[PDB]
Coordinates of C-alpha atoms in Angstrom, one line a residue:
Chain A
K14 CA 45.2 10.4 -41.3
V15 CA 47.0 13.3 -40.4
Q16 CA 47.8 12.8 -36.7
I17 CA 49.6 15.4 -34.4
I18 CA 49.4 15.6 -30.8
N19 CA 51.6 17.8 -28.2
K20 CA 50.9 16.3 -24.3
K21 CA 53.3 16.8 -21.2
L22 CA 51.8 14.6 -18.5
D23 CA 50.3 11.8 -18.9
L24 CA 50.5 9.6 -15.6
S25 CA 52.8 11.8 -13.2
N26 CA 53.3 12.7 -9.6
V27 CA 55.4 15.5 -9.4
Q28 CA 56.2 16.4 -5.8
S29 CA 58.4 19.5 -5.6
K30 CA 60.1 21.3 -2.1
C31 CA 58.7 18.9 0.5
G32 CA 59.9 19.6 3.7
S33 CA 62.0 22.0 3.2
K34 CA 63.2 25.3 3.8
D35 CA 62.7 24.3 7.7
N36 CA 64.4 25.2 10.7
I37 CA 63.7 23.5 14.1
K38 CA 65.8 24.9 17.4
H39 CA 65.0 23.6 20.6
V40 CA 66.3 25.4 23.7
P41 CA 65.4 22.9 26.5
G42 CA 66.6 24.4 30.2
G43 CA 65.1 20.5 32.0
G44 CA 63.5 17.7 30.9
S45 CA 62.0 18.2 27.5
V46 CA 61.2 16.2 24.0
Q47 CA 61.3 17.3 20.7
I48 CA 59.3 15.4 17.7
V49 CA 59.1 15.9 14.4
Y50 CA 58.1 13.4 11.9
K51 CA 57.9 14.4 8.2
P52 CA 56.7 11.3 6.0
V53 CA 56.8 12.3 2.3
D54 CA 55.3 9.3 0.9
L55 CA 54.2 8.1 -2.3
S56 CA 52.8 5.4 -4.1
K57 CA 51.5 4.1 -7.5
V58 CA 50.3 0.6 -6.8
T59 CA 48.3 -0.5 -9.8
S60 CA 47.0 -4.1 -9.1
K61 CA 45.4 -6.8 -10.9
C62 CA 44.1 -10.4 -9.1
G63 CA 41.8 -12.0 -8.3
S64 CA 40.7 -16.3 -8.1
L65 CA 41.7 -16.4 -4.0
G66 CA 44.1 -13.8 -4.6
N67 CA 44.6 -13.2 -0.8
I68 CA 46.5 -10.2 -1.0
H69 CA 48.4 -8.6 2.1
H70 CA 50.1 -4.9 1.5
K71 CA 50.8 -3.5 5.1
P72 CA 53.6 -0.7 4.8
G73 CA 54.2 -1.0 8.4
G74 CA 54.4 2.7 9.6
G75 CA 56.6 4.4 12.0
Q76 CA 56.9 3.9 15.9
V77 CA 58.3 7.0 18.2
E78 CA 58.5 5.1 21.5
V79 CA 59.4 7.7 24.4
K80 CA 59.8 5.7 28.5
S81 CA 61.3 8.2 31.1
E82 CA 60.8 6.0 35.3
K83 CA 63.6 8.3 36.9
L84 CA 64.1 11.8 36.7
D85 CA 64.6 14.3 39.6
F86 CA 66.3 17.7 39.3
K87 CA 66.4 18.7 43.0
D88 CA 68.1 22.4 43.1
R89 CA 68.3 24.2 40.1
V90 CA 67.7 24.6 36.4
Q91 CA 68.6 28.0 35.2
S92 CA 68.6 29.7 31.6
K93 CA 69.9 33.2 30.8
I94 CA 69.8 33.9 27.1
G95 CA 70.8 36.7 24.9
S96 CA 70.0 36.1 21.3
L97 CA 68.9 33.0 19.3
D98 CA 68.9 33.6 15.3
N99 CA 70.4 37.0 14.3
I100 CA 69.1 36.2 10.8
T101 CA 69.5 38.4 7.7
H102 CA 68.1 36.4 5.0
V103 CA 69.1 39.0 2.1
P104 CA 67.8 38.5 -1.2
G105 CA 68.8 41.2 -3.2
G106 CA 69.1 40.2 -6.5
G107 CA 66.2 41.9 -9.2
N108 CA 66.4 38.7 -10.7
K109 CA 64.6 37.8 -14.6
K110 CA 62.6 34.6 -14.8
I111 CA 62.0 34.2 -18.9
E112 CA 59.4 31.5 -19.6
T113 CA 58.8 30.8 -22.6
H114 CA 56.1 28.0 -23.8
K115 CA 55.3 28.5 -27.2
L116 CA 52.8 26.4 -29.1
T117 CA 53.1 27.2 -33.0
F118 CA 50.8 24.3 -34.7
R119 CA 50.7 25.5 -38.8
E120 CA 47.9 22.8 -40.6
Chain B
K11 CA 40.9 13.3 -40.7
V12 CA 43.2 16.1 -39.6
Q13 CA 43.3 15.9 -35.5
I14 CA 45.6 18.3 -34.0
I15 CA 45.4 17.8 -30.2
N16 CA 47.7 19.8 -27.6
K17 CA 47.4 19.0 -23.8
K18 CA 48.6 19.8 -21.1
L19 CA 47.9 16.8 -18.6
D20 CA 45.4 14.1 -17.9
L21 CA 46.2 11.7 -14.7
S22 CA 48.5 14.1 -12.7
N23 CA 49.5 14.8 -8.8
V24 CA 51.4 18.1 -8.5
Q25 CA 52.2 19.4 -5.1
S26 CA 54.3 21.9 -4.5
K27 CA 55.6 23.6 -1.1
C28 CA 54.3 21.0 0.8
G29 CA 55.3 21.7 4.4
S30 CA 57.4 24.6 3.6
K31 CA 59.3 27.4 5.1
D32 CA 59.0 25.9 8.6
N33 CA 60.1 26.9 12.3
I34 CA 59.7 25.3 14.7
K35 CA 61.1 26.3 18.2
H36 CA 61.5 25.5 22.0
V37 CA 62.7 27.4 24.8
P38 CA 61.3 25.1 28.3
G39 CA 62.1 25.9 31.0
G40 CA 60.9 22.3 32.8
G41 CA 59.0 19.4 31.7
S42 CA 58.3 19.7 28.5
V43 CA 57.2 18.0 25.2
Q44 CA 57.0 18.8 21.7
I45 CA 55.1 16.8 18.5
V46 CA 55.2 17.7 15.2
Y47 CA 53.6 15.5 12.4
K48 CA 53.8 16.7 8.8
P49 CA 52.9 13.4 6.7
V50 CA 52.8 14.4 3.5
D51 CA 51.1 11.5 1.6
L52 CA 50.3 10.6 -2.3
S53 CA 48.5 7.6 -3.5
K54 CA 47.5 6.6 -7.3
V55 CA 45.5 3.1 -6.1
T56 CA 44.3 1.7 -9.4
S57 CA 42.8 -2.2 -8.3
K58 CA 41.2 -4.6 -10.2
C59 CA 40.0 -7.8 -8.9
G60 CA 37.7 -10.5 -7.6
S61 CA 36.5 -13.6 -7.6
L62 CA 37.5 -14.6 -3.8
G63 CA 40.2 -11.9 -3.6
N64 CA 40.6 -10.8 -0.7
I65 CA 42.3 -7.7 -0.6
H66 CA 44.1 -5.9 2.6
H67 CA 45.8 -2.6 1.3
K68 CA 46.8 -1.9 5.4
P69 CA 49.7 0.9 5.6
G70 CA 50.5 1.1 9.1
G71 CA 50.1 4.7 10.8
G72 CA 52.8 6.5 12.4
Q73 CA 52.5 6.1 16.6
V74 CA 54.0 8.0 18.8
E75 CA 54.2 7.7 22.3
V76 CA 55.4 9.2 25.6
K77 CA 55.0 7.8 28.7
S78 CA 56.8 9.8 31.8
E79 CA 56.5 8.5 35.2
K80 CA 58.8 9.6 37.8
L81 CA 59.4 13.5 37.1
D82 CA 59.9 15.6 40.0
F83 CA 61.8 19.6 40.3
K84 CA 62.6 20.0 44.0
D85 CA 64.0 23.8 43.9
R86 CA 64.3 26.2 40.7
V87 CA 63.5 26.7 37.3
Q88 CA 64.7 30.1 36.1
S89 CA 64.2 31.3 32.6
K90 CA 65.6 34.9 31.9
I91 CA 65.7 35.7 28.3
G92 CA 66.7 38.4 26.1
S93 CA 65.6 37.5 22.3
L94 CA 64.8 35.1 19.9
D95 CA 65.0 35.9 16.0
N96 CA 66.1 38.7 15.1
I97 CA 64.6 38.2 11.1
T98 CA 64.9 40.9 8.8
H99 CA 64.1 38.5 6.0
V100 CA 64.7 41.1 3.1
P101 CA 63.5 40.5 -0.6
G102 CA 64.7 43.8 -1.9
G103 CA 64.8 42.9 -5.6
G104 CA 62.5 44.4 -8.2
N105 CA 62.5 41.2 -9.7
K106 CA 60.6 40.3 -13.3
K107 CA 58.3 36.7 -13.9
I108 CA 58.1 36.6 -17.7
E109 CA 55.7 33.6 -18.3
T110 CA 55.1 33.1 -21.7
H111 CA 52.2 31.1 -23.1
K112 CA 51.2 31.3 -26.4
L113 CA 48.9 29.1 -28.4
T114 CA 49.2 29.6 -32.3
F115 CA 47.0 27.2 -33.9
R116 CA 46.3 27.9 -38.3
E117 CA 44.5 25.5 -39.9
Chain C
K18 CA 37.1 15.6 -40.4
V19 CA 39.0 18.8 -38.8
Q20 CA 39.4 18.3 -34.8
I21 CA 41.6 21.1 -32.8
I22 CA 41.2 20.6 -28.8
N23 CA 43.5 22.8 -27.0
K24 CA 42.9 21.5 -23.7
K25 CA 45.1 21.9 -20.1
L26 CA 44.0 19.5 -17.5
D27 CA 41.9 16.6 -17.4
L28 CA 43.1 14.6 -14.1
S29 CA 44.6 16.6 -12.1
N30 CA 45.5 17.3 -8.0
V31 CA 47.3 20.3 -7.8
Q32 CA 48.3 21.4 -3.8
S33 CA 50.4 24.6 -3.9
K34 CA 51.6 26.1 -0.5
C35 CA 50.1 23.1 1.5
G36 CA 51.5 23.7 5.2
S37 CA 53.4 26.2 4.2
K38 CA 55.5 29.5 5.9
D39 CA 54.3 27.9 9.2
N40 CA 56.0 29.1 12.5
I41 CA 55.5 27.3 16.1
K42 CA 56.6 29.2 19.2
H43 CA 56.8 27.1 22.6
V44 CA 58.1 28.9 25.8
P45 CA 56.8 26.6 28.7
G46 CA 58.1 27.8 32.3
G47 CA 56.5 24.5 33.3
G48 CA 55.0 21.1 32.3
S49 CA 53.6 22.2 28.8
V50 CA 52.9 19.9 26.1
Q51 CA 52.6 21.1 22.6
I52 CA 51.2 19.6 19.5
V53 CA 50.8 20.3 16.2
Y54 CA 49.4 17.5 13.8
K55 CA 49.3 18.6 9.8
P56 CA 48.8 15.9 7.4
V57 CA 48.6 16.5 4.0
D58 CA 47.3 13.5 2.2
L59 CA 46.2 12.9 -1.2
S60 CA 44.5 9.9 -2.8
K61 CA 43.2 8.7 -6.3
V62 CA 41.5 5.4 -5.4
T63 CA 40.3 3.8 -8.8
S64 CA 38.9 0.1 -7.9
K65 CA 37.0 -2.2 -10.2
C66 CA 36.0 -5.6 -8.2
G67 CA 33.1 -7.9 -7.3
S68 CA 32.2 -11.4 -6.8
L69 CA 32.9 -11.8 -3.3
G70 CA 35.8 -9.4 -3.5
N71 CA 36.6 -8.7 -0.1
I72 CA 38.4 -5.3 -0.3
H73 CA 39.9 -4.1 2.5
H74 CA 41.6 -0.6 2.2
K75 CA 42.2 0.4 6.0
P76 CA 44.9 3.1 5.9
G77 CA 45.7 3.4 9.7
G78 CA 45.9 6.8 10.9
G79 CA 48.3 8.5 13.3
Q80 CA 48.4 8.5 17.0
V81 CA 49.6 10.4 19.8
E82 CA 49.7 9.1 23.5
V83 CA 50.9 10.9 26.0
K84 CA 51.1 10.0 29.9
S85 CA 52.9 11.8 32.7
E86 CA 52.3 10.4 36.0
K87 CA 54.4 11.8 38.6
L88 CA 55.0 15.4 38.4
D89 CA 55.8 18.1 41.5
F90 CA 57.6 20.9 40.9
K91 CA 58.2 22.1 44.7
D92 CA 59.6 25.5 44.6
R93 CA 60.1 27.8 42.0
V94 CA 59.5 28.8 38.5
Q95 CA 59.8 32.2 37.1
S96 CA 59.7 33.2 33.6
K97 CA 61.1 37.0 32.5
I98 CA 61.3 37.3 28.8
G99 CA 62.4 40.6 27.4
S100 CA 62.2 39.8 23.2
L101 CA 60.7 37.1 21.3
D102 CA 60.3 37.6 17.4
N103 CA 61.6 40.9 16.6
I104 CA 61.1 40.0 12.0
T105 CA 61.0 42.6 9.9
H106 CA 60.0 40.6 6.8
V107 CA 60.4 43.3 4.2
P108 CA 59.1 42.7 0.7
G109 CA 60.7 46.2 -1.1
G110 CA 60.4 45.1 -4.7
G111 CA 58.5 46.9 -7.1
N112 CA 58.2 43.5 -8.6
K113 CA 56.6 42.7 -12.3
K114 CA 54.6 39.7 -13.3
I115 CA 53.8 39.5 -16.6
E116 CA 51.6 36.2 -17.3
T117 CA 51.3 35.9 -21.7
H118 CA 48.1 32.9 -22.0
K119 CA 47.2 34.3 -25.5
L120 CA 44.4 31.7 -27.5
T121 CA 45.0 32.3 -31.3
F122 CA 43.1 30.1 -33.6
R123 CA 42.4 30.6 -37.1
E124 CA 40.4 28.0 -38.6
Chain D
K30 CA 74.2 28.5 136.8
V31 CA 73.1 25.1 135.3
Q32 CA 72.8 25.9 131.3
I33 CA 71.4 23.0 128.7
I34 CA 70.7 23.0 125.9
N35 CA 69.9 21.0 122.8
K36 CA 69.3 22.6 119.2
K37 CA 69.4 21.5 115.5
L38 CA 69.5 24.1 113.3
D39 CA 70.1 27.9 113.7
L40 CA 71.0 29.5 110.7
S41 CA 70.0 27.1 107.6
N42 CA 69.5 26.1 103.7
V43 CA 68.5 22.5 103.5
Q44 CA 67.3 21.2 100.4
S45 CA 66.7 18.1 99.4
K46 CA 65.4 16.2 96.1
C47 CA 65.6 19.5 94.0
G48 CA 65.2 18.5 90.0
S49 CA 64.9 15.2 90.8
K50 CA 63.7 12.0 89.2
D51 CA 63.1 13.9 85.4
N52 CA 62.0 12.7 82.6
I53 CA 62.2 14.9 79.6
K54 CA 61.3 13.4 76.1
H55 CA 60.9 14.8 72.7
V56 CA 59.8 12.8 69.4
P57 CA 59.4 15.4 66.6
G58 CA 58.4 14.6 63.5
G59 CA 59.5 18.1 62.2
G60 CA 60.7 21.5 63.3
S61 CA 60.6 21.2 66.8
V62 CA 62.0 23.2 70.1
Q63 CA 62.0 21.7 73.9
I64 CA 63.5 23.8 75.9
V65 CA 63.7 23.4 79.9
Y66 CA 65.1 25.5 82.6
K67 CA 65.4 23.8 86.2
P68 CA 67.8 27.0 88.1
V69 CA 68.0 25.9 91.6
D70 CA 69.4 28.6 93.4
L71 CA 70.6 29.8 96.8
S72 CA 72.2 32.5 98.1
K73 CA 72.7 34.2 101.7
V74 CA 74.1 37.6 101.1
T75 CA 74.9 39.2 104.5
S76 CA 75.8 42.9 103.6
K77 CA 76.7 46.0 105.7
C78 CA 78.1 48.8 104.1
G79 CA 77.1 52.5 103.9
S80 CA 79.0 56.1 103.3
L81 CA 79.1 55.7 99.4
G82 CA 79.1 52.1 99.9
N83 CA 78.1 51.8 96.0
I84 CA 76.9 48.3 95.8
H85 CA 76.0 46.7 92.6
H86 CA 75.3 42.7 93.1
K87 CA 73.8 42.0 89.6
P88 CA 73.9 37.9 89.0
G89 CA 73.4 37.9 85.8
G90 CA 70.1 35.4 84.5
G91 CA 70.0 32.8 81.8
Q92 CA 69.3 33.9 78.2
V93 CA 68.0 30.9 75.7
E94 CA 68.0 32.3 72.1
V95 CA 66.4 30.6 69.0
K96 CA 66.6 32.6 65.5
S97 CA 65.3 30.1 62.8
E98 CA 65.3 31.7 59.6
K99 CA 64.8 29.5 56.5
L100 CA 62.8 26.3 56.8
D101 CA 60.8 24.3 54.5
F102 CA 60.0 20.7 54.4
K103 CA 58.7 20.0 50.5
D104 CA 57.2 16.7 50.7
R105 CA 56.5 13.9 53.7
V106 CA 56.8 14.0 57.2
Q107 CA 55.6 10.8 58.8
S108 CA 56.2 8.8 62.0
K109 CA 54.9 5.4 63.2
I110 CA 55.1 5.0 66.6
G111 CA 54.4 1.5 68.5
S112 CA 55.8 2.1 72.1
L113 CA 57.5 4.7 74.5
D114 CA 58.2 3.9 78.2
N115 CA 57.4 0.8 79.0
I116 CA 58.2 1.1 82.6
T117 CA 57.7 -1.6 85.7
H118 CA 58.5 0.9 88.2
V119 CA 58.1 -2.5 90.9
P120 CA 59.1 -1.3 94.4
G121 CA 58.6 -4.3 96.1
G122 CA 60.0 -4.2 99.5
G123 CA 58.6 -4.4 102.8
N124 CA 60.8 -2.2 103.7
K125 CA 61.4 -0.5 107.6
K126 CA 62.5 2.5 108.4
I127 CA 62.9 3.2 112.0
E128 CA 63.8 6.6 113.4
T129 CA 64.6 6.8 116.6
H130 CA 65.0 10.3 117.7
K131 CA 65.2 10.5 121.7
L132 CA 64.9 13.5 124.4
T133 CA 66.6 12.2 127.7
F134 CA 67.1 15.1 130.4
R135 CA 67.5 14.8 134.4
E136 CA 68.1 17.6 135.8
Chain E
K28 CA 78.8 27.4 135.8
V29 CA 78.1 24.4 134.0
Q30 CA 77.8 24.6 130.4
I31 CA 76.5 22.2 128.0
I32 CA 75.2 22.3 124.8
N33 CA 74.6 19.9 121.9
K34 CA 73.9 21.6 118.3
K35 CA 74.1 20.3 115.0
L36 CA 74.1 23.1 112.2
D37 CA 74.7 26.9 113.0
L38 CA 75.2 28.3 109.4
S39 CA 74.9 25.7 106.7
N40 CA 74.2 25.5 103.3
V41 CA 73.1 21.3 102.8
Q42 CA 71.6 20.3 99.0
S43 CA 71.0 16.6 98.3
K44 CA 69.9 15.3 95.1
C45 CA 69.9 18.3 93.2
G46 CA 69.6 17.4 89.4
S47 CA 69.5 13.8 90.2
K48 CA 68.1 10.8 88.5
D49 CA 67.1 12.4 85.4
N50 CA 66.3 11.2 82.1
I51 CA 66.5 13.0 78.8
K52 CA 65.8 11.6 75.4
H53 CA 65.3 12.9 71.9
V54 CA 64.4 11.3 68.8
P55 CA 64.1 14.2 66.2
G56 CA 62.8 13.2 62.8
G57 CA 63.9 16.3 61.0
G58 CA 64.9 19.9 62.5
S59 CA 65.2 19.2 66.4
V60 CA 66.6 21.8 69.1
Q61 CA 66.6 20.2 72.6
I62 CA 68.0 22.8 75.5
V63 CA 68.1 21.5 79.3
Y64 CA 69.3 23.9 81.6
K65 CA 70.2 22.8 85.4
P66 CA 72.1 25.4 86.9
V67 CA 72.7 24.6 90.8
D68 CA 74.1 27.9 92.3
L69 CA 74.8 28.4 96.1
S70 CA 76.7 31.6 97.5
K71 CA 77.6 32.6 100.8
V72 CA 78.4 36.4 100.2
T73 CA 79.3 38.2 103.4
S74 CA 80.3 42.0 102.7
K75 CA 81.7 44.5 105.1
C76 CA 82.1 48.0 102.8
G77 CA 81.5 51.5 102.4
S78 CA 83.4 54.7 102.2
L79 CA 83.2 54.8 98.5
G80 CA 83.8 51.5 98.0
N81 CA 82.4 51.0 94.8
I82 CA 81.5 46.6 94.6
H83 CA 80.3 45.3 91.7
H84 CA 79.6 41.6 92.4
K85 CA 78.4 40.5 88.3
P86 CA 78.2 36.8 87.9
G87 CA 78.0 36.6 84.3
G88 CA 75.2 34.0 83.8
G89 CA 74.9 31.4 80.9
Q90 CA 73.9 32.5 77.6
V91 CA 72.2 29.9 74.7
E92 CA 72.7 30.9 70.9
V93 CA 70.9 29.3 68.1
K94 CA 71.0 30.9 64.7
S95 CA 69.9 28.6 61.5
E96 CA 69.1 30.3 58.9
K97 CA 69.0 27.5 55.4
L98 CA 67.5 24.4 55.8
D99 CA 64.9 22.7 53.5
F100 CA 64.4 18.6 53.6
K101 CA 63.2 18.3 49.6
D102 CA 61.3 14.8 50.1
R103 CA 61.4 12.5 52.9
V104 CA 61.5 12.1 56.6
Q105 CA 60.2 8.8 57.9
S106 CA 60.3 7.9 61.6
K107 CA 59.4 4.4 62.3
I108 CA 59.8 3.8 66.2
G109 CA 59.4 0.5 67.6
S110 CA 60.1 0.8 71.4
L111 CA 62.1 3.0 74.0
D112 CA 63.0 2.5 77.6
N113 CA 61.7 -1.0 78.7
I114 CA 62.8 -0.3 82.0
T115 CA 62.2 -3.0 85.0
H116 CA 63.0 -0.8 87.8
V117 CA 63.3 -3.2 90.3
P118 CA 64.1 -2.3 93.8
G119 CA 63.3 -5.5 95.3
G120 CA 65.0 -5.2 99.1
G121 CA 63.0 -5.5 102.3
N122 CA 65.1 -3.0 103.5
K123 CA 66.2 -1.7 106.9
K124 CA 67.1 1.9 107.5
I125 CA 67.8 2.3 111.6
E126 CA 68.5 6.0 112.4
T127 CA 69.5 5.6 116.3
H128 CA 69.8 9.6 117.5
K129 CA 69.7 9.6 121.0
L130 CA 69.7 12.3 123.6
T131 CA 70.8 11.3 127.4
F132 CA 71.7 14.4 129.7
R133 CA 71.9 13.5 133.3
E134 CA 72.9 16.8 135.1
Chain F
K25 CA 83.5 27.4 134.8
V26 CA 82.4 23.6 133.1
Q27 CA 82.0 24.5 129.7
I28 CA 81.1 21.2 127.2
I29 CA 79.9 21.3 123.8
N30 CA 79.2 19.0 121.1
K31 CA 78.3 20.8 117.2
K32 CA 78.7 19.6 114.4
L33 CA 78.0 22.4 112.0
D34 CA 79.5 25.9 112.3
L35 CA 80.0 27.5 109.1
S36 CA 79.3 24.6 105.5
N37 CA 78.8 24.0 102.6
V38 CA 77.0 20.5 101.4
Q39 CA 76.6 19.1 98.5
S40 CA 75.9 16.3 97.5
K41 CA 74.5 13.9 94.3
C42 CA 74.8 16.8 92.4
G43 CA 74.0 16.7 89.0
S44 CA 74.0 12.7 89.2
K45 CA 72.5 9.7 87.6
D46 CA 71.9 11.4 84.6
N47 CA 71.1 9.7 81.3
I48 CA 70.8 12.0 78.1
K49 CA 70.2 10.1 74.8
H50 CA 70.1 11.7 71.5
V51 CA 68.6 10.2 67.9
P52 CA 68.4 12.3 65.7
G53 CA 67.3 11.6 62.3
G54 CA 68.2 14.7 60.2
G55 CA 69.0 18.0 61.4
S56 CA 68.9 18.0 65.5
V57 CA 70.5 20.1 68.2
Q58 CA 70.5 18.7 72.0
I59 CA 72.1 21.2 75.0
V60 CA 72.7 20.5 78.3
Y61 CA 73.4 22.8 80.9
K62 CA 74.6 22.2 84.5
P63 CA 76.7 24.1 86.4
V64 CA 77.1 23.6 89.9
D65 CA 78.2 26.6 91.4
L66 CA 79.6 27.1 94.9
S67 CA 80.9 30.4 96.5
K68 CA 81.7 31.4 99.8
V69 CA 82.7 35.4 99.3
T70 CA 83.9 37.0 102.7
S71 CA 84.7 40.5 101.5
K72 CA 85.6 43.7 103.5
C73 CA 86.5 47.1 101.5
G74 CA 86.2 50.4 101.6
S75 CA 87.9 53.5 101.0
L76 CA 87.6 54.2 97.3
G77 CA 87.9 49.7 97.1
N78 CA 86.7 49.3 93.5
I79 CA 85.9 46.1 93.6
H80 CA 85.1 44.3 90.1
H81 CA 84.3 40.3 90.9
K82 CA 82.7 39.8 87.8
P83 CA 82.8 35.2 87.0
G84 CA 82.4 35.5 83.6
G85 CA 79.5 32.5 82.6
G86 CA 79.3 29.6 79.9
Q87 CA 78.2 30.7 76.5
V88 CA 76.6 28.8 73.9
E89 CA 76.8 29.9 70.7
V90 CA 75.2 27.8 67.2
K91 CA 74.8 29.1 63.5
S92 CA 74.1 27.0 60.6
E93 CA 73.7 28.2 57.8
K94 CA 73.3 26.3 54.7
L95 CA 71.5 22.8 55.1
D96 CA 69.8 21.2 52.6
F97 CA 68.5 17.2 52.6
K98 CA 67.1 16.8 49.1
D99 CA 65.7 13.6 49.2
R100 CA 65.6 11.1 52.2
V101 CA 65.5 10.9 55.8
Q102 CA 64.5 7.5 57.4
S103 CA 65.1 5.9 60.6
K104 CA 63.4 2.5 61.5
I105 CA 63.8 1.8 65.3
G106 CA 63.6 -1.4 67.4
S107 CA 64.7 -1.0 71.2
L108 CA 66.8 1.9 73.1
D109 CA 67.4 1.7 76.2
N110 CA 66.6 -2.0 78.0
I111 CA 67.4 -1.4 81.3
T112 CA 66.7 -4.4 84.4
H113 CA 67.9 -2.0 87.0
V114 CA 67.6 -4.4 89.7
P115 CA 68.6 -3.2 93.4
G116 CA 67.6 -7.0 95.2
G117 CA 69.5 -6.8 98.3
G118 CA 67.5 -6.4 102.1
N119 CA 70.2 -3.9 103.3
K120 CA 70.5 -2.7 106.5
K121 CA 71.4 0.5 107.5
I122 CA 72.4 0.9 110.8
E123 CA 73.2 4.6 111.6
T124 CA 74.2 4.8 115.2
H125 CA 74.3 9.1 116.6
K126 CA 74.0 8.2 120.1
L127 CA 74.4 11.5 122.8
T128 CA 75.5 10.6 126.0
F129 CA 76.1 13.9 128.7
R130 CA 76.6 12.8 132.0
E131 CA 77.3 16.1 134.4

């Protein structure tokens, strides 16, 4: 009766880089709406019920409401732009990622 | 009775780079709506019920509502643009990704 | 009774680079709507029921609503553009991806 | 040598009701020019000249000059009219114009 | 040598009701020019000249100059009118104009 | 040598009711010019000249100059009118104009 087990994950939710490295840029001249909706939502619902069990699982969702009624721009909207986002994203390293995962079993 | 098991994942939800490396750019002159809807949604619903069990699983979804009523631009909308997004994304590294996954079993 | 098992994944949901490396760019002159709808949605629904079990699984979906009523641009909409997106995406590395996955079994 | 003369007019310019009983009415909605030019002009030019007599009779006439360059009516011109000129011009008199001009000559 | 003369007018300029009983009415909504030009002009020019006589009779005439350059009415011009000119011009007199002009000559 | 003369006018300029009984009414909503030009002009020019006589009779005439450059009415021009000019011009007299002009000559 020699029992030997190596096991990584049995019941797991792994979420990496969720809503990540994000640039949201707005240059309105006039009358502009920008909307960004990033729900990162995670649920383990384990449920045991019965016998007239009245379960009402109701996660209210998000709401966005916009009402513009009176908007007038009588004369002038002018946008003179030179330069957005001068980005040198320079990864210059000759990196070494050594990832040892070694599995020795002598029975 | 020599039992030996190596096993990585049995019940797993892995989510990598979800909604990732994202650029959202708006240059409205006049009267513009930009909408971005990134729900990253994850559920393990384990349910055991019965016997008049009345289950009401209702995750409200997201809502977006836009109402513009009065909008006038009587004279001038002008957009003179030189340069957006001067991006040198320079990965210059001669990287080494060593990934050892070795499986030794001597029975 | 010599039992030996190597096994990677039994019950697994793997999602890599989902909604990833995304550029959304809008240059409206006048009267523009941009809509982006990226739901990355993941569900393990394990259900055991019966006996008048009334299951109502109802994930509300997302809603987008746009109503423009009064919109007039009496005179001028002008867009003079030089340059969008000067992108040198330069991967210049002679990378080495060493991926060892070795399977030794001596019975 | 009995000389008797009755004589009314020898050298006469008579002008009665000249530019008279005049109604000029303008109800412009938008962009209207109304021009009225009533010169009542009277000249007795008695001239005796000669011998290199250089006569330059030059009555400058009237000038009217209208220059409209930039005229825009972007949205609305509305004219709702009930009643112009409710005129009871009522001459109600049984007038008597007795005009005696009697010419008695007993020679 | 009995000389008898009755004589009314020899050298006469008579001008009655010149530019008379005049109504000029303007109800502009927008952008209106009304021009009225009533010159009542009277000249007895008696001239005797000669011998290199250089006569320059130059009555400058009237000038009217109108220059509109920038005129915009972006939204609304509305004219709601009930009643102009409720005129009871009531001559109600039974007038008597007795005009005796009697010419008695007993020679 | 019995000389008898009755004579009314020899060298006469008579001007009655010149520019007379005049109503000039303006109800501009927006941007209106009203111009009225009533010159009542009277000249007896008696001239005797010669012998290099350089006569320069130059009556400068009247000038009217209007220059509008920048004129904008961005939103609203409204004119609601009930009543102009409720005029009872009531001559109600039974007048008597007795005009005796009688010419008795007994030679």
